[PDB]
Design a protein around this ligand. Structure first.
Ligand SMILES: Nc1ncnc2c1ncn2[C@@H]1O[C@H](COP(=O)(O)OP(=O)(O)OP(=O)(O)O)[C@@H](O)[C@H]1O
Ligand SMILES: Nc1ncnc2c1ncn2[C@@H]1O[C@H](COP(=O)(O)OP(=O)(O)OP(O)(O)=S)[C@@H](O)[C@H]1O
Lengths: 48, 173, 404, 57, 21, 61, 437, 94, 30, 179
């Protein structure tokens, strides 16, 4: 691909809601709270 | 256990438990400084020795000590509940400045030691009571009237309009 | 923790956006216009005091294309903002005001003078509306197409600084479309009943002249005030009816596509077919229009090409990777895709060209204010504000030493 | 029908109890003063505190 | 109750059996 | 690894209601009260566990 | 970590893709003709086509017969049943020799049973009956479905079951918050316990709180288990019977080995054939290794005649070092390998040869490497000469005592003096027999 | 061939490469950092708006669900009471 | 695999010492 | 920013129901936050502003001061220009203006040239300013003890390639790949 260096979404699995959420990347918003972003990937259905 | 739903009107304070159909405690949001300090239920009776202040003008909190006393009365007298053991849901007028919401959070957590808190817009809660996904809310409250458009439960702040007449000035007229 | 008690004011050509830093959206949005009455500016401010008909009250605009036209009326606009909408005395809150890049430097100086001397705010800063619009999208390398009622402009920004000489100005803006629909009204004879008199709705079927009555209590209104209100009516018409063709306007396609329905305040209603597609083509090609069709008129794609070309290739590739469209006129239905194809033809697709997605009314109008909110709460930015004790000499020397 | 389908009665996830002394997850509950605790030091501290409380009251 | 005896600890302070009077 | 509970039993109280009861266990340094399910109640009544005897309870089993 | 047995260096037959044995490869040196024959036999076994074929490995002791058999086992892998057996094993006090032989025959026939279980797993969020005014007339309270909400870590699914599942729902103590398994096919609810979320540290009951099922509600996929035909024979011969009088009485009596009838084995054959026809089972026939086959008696060989002619038999490898020996069970009948001539008639004989000194040296070096022993070339030559004098096993066995002596001496290598000293401490059969005479 | 010559003459000064790349370095500074803090905060703003719109949608739709389920529960209760009285009448008549 | 800590996107960290770097504004160097 | 996807996922404690965490919250209390005045050490003028902090960190320091780094600028007033920082085409006024402006815009050459005053001084291109800055830095280095022309060739090569009329773009790019 074009090799953009910032849009490093990746497959991730949470622990409490233990499931593969798909492409998600971690970020720190205001107040020091770690947030997971997400993509509505066309693979969304495959994660059943 | 239960969540405390304290609605801070502009002259009328409503309180109760989450899940109850009606606000059990309703008392006017009066606070009086003698000529101790007393809130509406007793303040309205103590006028002769008392001078009456309102902490909410037009839905926006005027000064924070009087509102502190209003909340103290609400909890400890009207509800008898311990603020440290219940989550608290506070409602504030639309277009409340950021500083006012922050001070509300500060007062709750610091002075009243609440475990969990939430501040929600009054108009969106009225829409929830109506039960409609999208709507326009005309809330002629106790001291100010607000026309709030809501799409998918999201209040559109740009379109909210304030007109500075409501029940109180209407009573004056 | 990066926030301070900052207020972001974004006064464009149509509405003034006032809100606190960190806020997702501007707190208030009320129009630039303001009322007048005989004695100074005996007054009427927002959409609530600017609309009730009154005995010979006249409406004016202290702004023009973003440059301040009357500083006393501007001061009173700000005074009412602080008094009611933000309802906080201004003596404590840092403020940053957005000015159009082509606004004069002397006007920036006079704005700082007014702000600090009269309102006695404790801090200040300036950053251009295009700079703030590119600020909202998080992009250093961006090209902005701002188009309000009174002016349409294209401005590139790199490293967060405007290419000050790379400014393109085009009156082909919301007022251009409004005049076009005005002449449409005249040619097919819409009688523009103002909503403020109507008191009955004896509506009629398509095309028929609706019946209605005017409220007896109405007093006389100056022509300027009636002009403003009917201009707002035709602005609503702009928003509702206008649509833009994907490709170059064609008569047979414009007739083929289904017509649309608009109803006027008095009950008069009409259906529009090819005219609504034709009108924005006037913006995209001034030649077909009446009068305002000289070769001097520059369309949107030509504007973007001119703005891109005037800057060298050390940043032009950056402009390629992001085209940002803001302002009112970009909300005409299917305007953004038409602009995208237009640039894809005008600008050689040989290298990497992308748009930047932004659609809703909040995102286009207030992207100028959203960037200001982003700056005001920025941690590093807190050092940049012009302090009052600094202002004592800064309002003259450092209002430029500091705010490029 | 009710005998065969009592249904309802939500499970009501318990409270993750904590030890007042060490603020550790609780794994014991003092039969006198059902305050939870996690360590023996916490137990003796809790019992001393109860003694002082009953002396005060 | 736990808080009838003892006393809440400020976040970041190590838990020690501070006891109300 | 076994992870057992040992203590002197101080009390086993009325289970009459599905039966529910409390068990108070005591070391020289601690005592705790346990809420007994049906299986544990049956085991305790089958062994005739009585106040003032030292038991060991295997948590896994 | 792992313990070094006498055959721990034998990893395969050491054949190239053409079927030819390398001089030394995969732990075997020399004996190329025998290794090539063993490769042919490995291909025969892998063909899974021929039943009851026998090969006899015949040669002097120490010529790699068991090494070759275990190399065959390694070549076939762990999936093919390899049943090793000594001829002395047939003399049981409990069962006859024929029964022991037949049981060992059934241990070399493997079976891969592939059963796909479909289960709906989760924590019961809701048990709600779906009421209807459905019946064929009737003023009663009717339900046409039972709604079960099953919650796993992945998600929640609402299952709608036959109303008849209400009986097992309370026969099992199934409530909301209980962990349950609903056989997709059987439709039988099964309360594993309660969810461990509803489990305080102050609760003493155990074996009641099970963790929330991981993954999807709908999954148990395929369970694959490998058994031998003897396992089925044994299981179906005496039922477990732990439920009633069988339980106490049978357990109380000693469980002797019984002489399973041909009727049971025929029934097991029929059942396995039906399992294979349904695709639930795969047959992997293996190889039976009878070492010291000369220890079998005439009755055992006569039975082997019939056992080797059945279509269900495995491949049998016989090892025998006997020169011309009286057959056990006969007084004066000598046949070549202690095996009757009529059993040798239905056997294919792979002959192993004595190793030359160089092959012995290679084997000794391989064994030293296997045992983690560093040996100098002089020590290796001297040990090869010792093996030429005495025997390969004797020289192979001096390696670890000599390595221990070197370690005691501060060395990490075996030198000539250490092997000489170990040779003086320990005697071989020849020298001991000279001393005895 | 013709392409080869056309590219050769053009490639002298006009094709096939941007001639060399400048190698001057640049120390990091305050404005670049402020622009990066910008980029991060704008990402935060957009993502927070997205979370708030989605959360308002989910919450208002769960409240609408609460109201609909409540109304259906009252209707079902009335119907069930009617059917229960009918079944009591049936049991007595039977 | 990606065998990383799916690193953070924090606010720009404060510098202990200079690290002279800047992207190519053209985003096209090759 | 995004590409029109699912909303962000945020940290939360009161997942479940504040019946789980009732104990973990009741046993602790908050560190008292205050609205406190501060002055950033990065500010040349000691102005003061407010912001929220913990009342135990009050007035400590501003962590963003470490982002206040600046790049150096040469110095010359009366004789260093003639002796070391010699010039024969640029006046002291033009050099000083360009240097002050470069500090303004932190040696970001493109916008530096964009501002470069075209009516107080004669016109010139970006690379002229870049190379002159290199020259001044070299001279400072000597007293205190890659090629601009190819960059102009760059600008012209890109201008020719892109200004290429669309049909010729297509044809040449075909010719580009064929051989
Ligand atoms: N749906 C619509 N589509 C397009 N234009 C609209 C729409 N609704 C209103 N407008 C007109 O578009 C303009 C709205 O943008 P506005 O003038 O507020 O921009 P601004 O952010 O102040 O920028 P500028 O500096 O270009 O004026 C006004 O002319 C408004 O009348
Ligand atoms: N060709 C060979 N290559 C490598 N090691 C071998 C070879 N032949 C035998 N060995 C090993 O040398 C030792 C002697 O061989 P064995 O297989 O034990 O003798 P054997 O011939 O199998 O015994 P019998 O008499 O046939 S039952 C064992 O450790 C074997 O693993």
């Amino acid at each position: 691909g074009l090799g953009d260096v910032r849009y490093r979404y990746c497959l991730t699995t949470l622990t409490v809601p233990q499931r593969c959420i798909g492409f998600a990347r971690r970020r720190v918003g205001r107040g020091g709270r770690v947030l997971l972003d997400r993509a509505h990937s066309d693979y969304d259905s495959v994660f059943h | 256990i239960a969540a405390l739903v304290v609605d801070n009107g502009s002259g009328m304070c409503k309180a109760g438990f989450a899940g109850d159909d009606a606000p059990r405690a309703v008392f006017p949001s009066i606070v009086g400084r003698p000529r101790d300090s007393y809130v509406g239920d007793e303040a309205q009776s103590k006028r002769g020795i008392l001078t009456l202040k309102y902490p909410i003008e037009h839905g926006i909190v005027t000064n924070w000590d009087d509102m502190e006393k209003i909340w103290h009365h609400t909890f400890y007298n009207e509800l008898r509940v311990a603020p440290e053991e219940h989550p608290v849901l506070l409602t504030e007028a639309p277009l409340n400045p950021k500083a006012n919401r922050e001070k509300m959070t500060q007062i709750m957590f610091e002075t009243f030691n609440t475990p969990a808190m939430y501040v929600a817009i009054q108009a969106v809660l009225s829409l929830y009571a109506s039960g409609r996904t999208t709507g326009i809310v005309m809330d002629s409250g106790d001291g100010v009237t607000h026309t709030v458009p809501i799409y998918e439960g999201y209040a559109l702040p740009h379109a909210i309009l304030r007109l500075d007449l409501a029940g109180r000035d209407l009573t004056d007229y | 923790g990066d926030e301070v008690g900052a207020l972001v004011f974004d006064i464009g050509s149509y509405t003034v956006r006032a809100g606190y830093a960190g806020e997702d959206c501007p707190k208030v949005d009320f129009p630039t216009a303001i009322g007048m009455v005989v004695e100074g500016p005996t007054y009427y401010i927002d959409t609530n005091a600017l609309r009730v008909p009154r005995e010979n009250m006249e409406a004016i605009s202290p702004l023009k294309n973003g440059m301040v036209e009357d500083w006393d009326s501007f001061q009173a606009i700000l005074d009412h903002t602080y008094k009611m909408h933000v309802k906080s005395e201004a003596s404590l809150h840092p403020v940053l005001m957005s000015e159009a890049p082509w606004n004069t430097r002397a006007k920036r100086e006079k704005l700082t003078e007014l702000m600090f001397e009269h309102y006695n705010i404790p801090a200040f800063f300036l950053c251009k509306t295009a700079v703030l619009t590119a600020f909202a999208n998080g992009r250093s390398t961006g090209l902005i197409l701002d188009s309000g009622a009174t002016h349409t402009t294209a401005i590139p920004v790199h490293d967060g600084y405007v290419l000050q000489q790379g400014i393109v100005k085009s009156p082909l803006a919301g007022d251009f479309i409004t005049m076009q629909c005005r002449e449409l009204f005249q040619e097919m004879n819409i009688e523009l009943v103002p909503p403020y008199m109507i008191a009955s709705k004896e509506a009629v079927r398509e095309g028929s002249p609706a019946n209605w009555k005017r409220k007896e209590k109405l007093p006389q209104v100056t022509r300027s005030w009636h002009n403003y209100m009917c201009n707002c009516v035709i602005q609503d018409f702009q928003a509702s009816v206008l649509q833009v063709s994907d490709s170059t306007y064609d008569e047979q396609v414009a007739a083929q596509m289904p017509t649309v329905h608009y109803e006027f305040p008095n009950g008069y209603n009409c259906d529009f077919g090819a005219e609504r597609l034709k009108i924005p083509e006037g913006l995209f090609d001034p030649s077909n229009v009446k009068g305002l069709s000289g070769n001097t008129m520059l369309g949107v794609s030509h504007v973007v090409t001119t703005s891109v070309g005037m800057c060298d290739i050390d940043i032009r590739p950056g402009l390629y990777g992001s085209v940002i469209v803001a302002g009112g006129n970009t909300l005409i239905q299917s305007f953004t895709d038409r602009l995208n194809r237009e640039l894809s033809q005008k600008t050689p697709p040989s290298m990497r060209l992308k748009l930047i997605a932004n659609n809703t009314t909040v995102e286009r109008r207030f992207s100028s204010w959203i960037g200001g909110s982003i700056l005001a709460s920025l941690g590093t930015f807190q050092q940049m504000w012009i302090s009052k004790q600094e202002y004592e000499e800064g309002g003259k020397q450092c209002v430029e030493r500091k705010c490029p | 029908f009710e005998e065969w389908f009592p249904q309802g009665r939500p499970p009501k996830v318990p409270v993750r109890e904590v030890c007042p002394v060490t603020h550790r997850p609780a794994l014991y509950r003092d039969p006198v003063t059902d305050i939870p605790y996690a360590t023996a030091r916490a137990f003796k501290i809790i019992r001393e505190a109860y003694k002082k409380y009953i002396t005060a009251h | 109750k736990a808080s009838r005896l003892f006393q809440p600890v400020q976040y970041g302070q190590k838990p020690e059996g501070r006891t109300v009077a | 690894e076994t992870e057992i509970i040992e203590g002197e039993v101080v009390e086993i109280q009325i289970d009459r209601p599905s039966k529910v009861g409390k068990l108070t266990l005591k070391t020289t340094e601690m005592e705790t009260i346990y809420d007994l399910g049906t299986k544990m109640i049956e085991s305790l009544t089958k062994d005739k566990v009585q106040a003032g005897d030292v038991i060991t309870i295997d948590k896994a089993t | 970590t792992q313990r070094i047995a006498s055959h721990s260096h034998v990893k395969g037959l050491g054949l190239d893709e053409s079927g030819l044995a390398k001089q030394a490869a995969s732990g075997l040196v020399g004996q190329e003709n025998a290794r090539e024959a063993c490769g042919v036999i490995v291909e025969l076994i892998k063909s899974k086509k021929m039943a009851g074929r026998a090969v006899l490995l015949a040669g002097p002791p120490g010529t790699g017969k068991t090494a070759l058999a275990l190399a065959i086992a390694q070549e076939l892998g762990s999936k093919v049943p390899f049943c090793p057996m000594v001829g002395s094993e047939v003399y049981s006090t409990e069962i006859k020799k024929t029964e022991v032989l037949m049981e060992n025959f059934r241990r070399a026939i493997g079976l891969r049973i592939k059963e796909t279980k479909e289960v709906y797993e989760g924590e019961v969020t809701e048990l709600t009956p779906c009421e209807t005014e459905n019946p064929m007339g009737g003023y009663g309270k009717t339900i046409s479905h039972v709604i079960i909400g099953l919650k796993t870590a992945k998600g929640t699914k609402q299952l709608k079951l036959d109303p008849s599942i209400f009986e097992s729902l309370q026969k099992e103590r199934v409530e909301a918050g209980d962990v349950i398994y609903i056989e997709a096919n059987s439709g039988a609810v099964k309360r594993q316990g309660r969810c461990d979320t509803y489990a305080t540290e102050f609760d003493l009951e155990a074996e009641e709180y099970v963790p929330l099922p991981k993954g999807d509600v709908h999954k148990k996929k395929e369970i694959i288990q490998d058994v031998t035909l003897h396992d089925l024979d044994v299981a179906n011969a005496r039922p477990q019977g732990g439920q009633d009088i069988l339980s106490m009485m049978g357990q109380l009596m000693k469980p002797k080995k019984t002489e399973i009838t041909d009727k049971l084995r025929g029934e097991i054959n029929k059942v396995v054939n039906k399992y294979i026809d349904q695709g639930i089972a795969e047959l992997v026939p293996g190889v039976l290794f009878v070492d010291e086959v000369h220890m079998l008696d005439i009755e055992c060989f006569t039975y082997l005649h019939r056992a080797l002619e059945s279509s269900i038999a495995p491949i049998v490898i016989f090892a025998s070092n006997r020169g011309n020996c009286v057959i056990r069970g006969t007084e004066d009948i000598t046949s070549p390998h202690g095996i009757p001539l009529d059993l040798l008639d239905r056997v294919m004989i792979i002959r192993t040869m004595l190793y030359t000194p160089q092959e012995m040296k290679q084997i000794i070096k391989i064994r030293a490497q296997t045992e983690g022993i560093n040996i100098s070339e002089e020590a290796l030559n001297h040990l090869g000469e010792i093996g030429t004098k005495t025997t390969l096993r004797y020289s192979v066995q001096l390696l670890t005592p000599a390595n221990l002596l070197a370690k005691i001496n501060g060395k990490d290598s075996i030198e000539k003096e250490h092997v000489e000293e170990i040779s003086e401490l320990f005697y071989d059969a020849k020298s001991s027999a000279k001393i005895l005479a | 061939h013709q392409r080869i010559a056309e590219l050769r003459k053009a490639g002298l000064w006009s094709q096939r490469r941007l001639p060399k790349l400048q190698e001057a370095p640049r120390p990091k500074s305050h404005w670049d950092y402020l622009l990066e803090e910008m980029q991060w905060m704008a990402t935060d703003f957009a993502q927070e708006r997205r979370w708030k719109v989605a959360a308002a949608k989910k919450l208002v739709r769960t409240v609408v669900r609460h109201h609909e389920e409540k109304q259906l529960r009252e209707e079902r209760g009335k119907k069930e009471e009617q059917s229960r009285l009918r079944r009591i009448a049936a049991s007595t008549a039977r | 695999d990606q065998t990383e800590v799916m690193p953070l996107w924090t606010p720009p960290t404060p510098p202990q010492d200079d690290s002279d770097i800047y992207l190519d504004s053209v985003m096209c160097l090759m | 920013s995004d590409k029109k996807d699912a909303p962000p996922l945020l940290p939360s404690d009161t997942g479940q129901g504040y019946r789980t965490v009732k104990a973990k919250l009741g046993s602790k209390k908050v560190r008292p936050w205050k609205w406190m005045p501060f002055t950033n050490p990065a500010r040349k003028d000691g102005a003061m502003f407010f912001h929220w902090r913990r009342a135990a960190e009050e007035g400590k320091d501003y962590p963003f001061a470490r982002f206040n780094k600046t790049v150096q600028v040469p110095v010359y007033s009366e004789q260093e220009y003639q002796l070391y920082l010699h010039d024969d085409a640029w006046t002291k006024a033009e050099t000083d203006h360009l240097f002050d402006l470069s500090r303004r815009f932190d040696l970001r050459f493109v916008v530096i040239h964009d501002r470069y005053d075209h009516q107080q001084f004669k016109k010139r291109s970006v690379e002229d300013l870049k190379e002159r800055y290199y020259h001044i830095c070299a001279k400072l280095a000597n007293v205190r003890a890659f090629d601009a022309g190819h960059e102009r060739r760059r600008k012209e090569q890109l201008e020719r390639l892109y200004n290429r009329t669309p049909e010729q773009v297509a044809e040449e790019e075909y010719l580009l790949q064929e051989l």
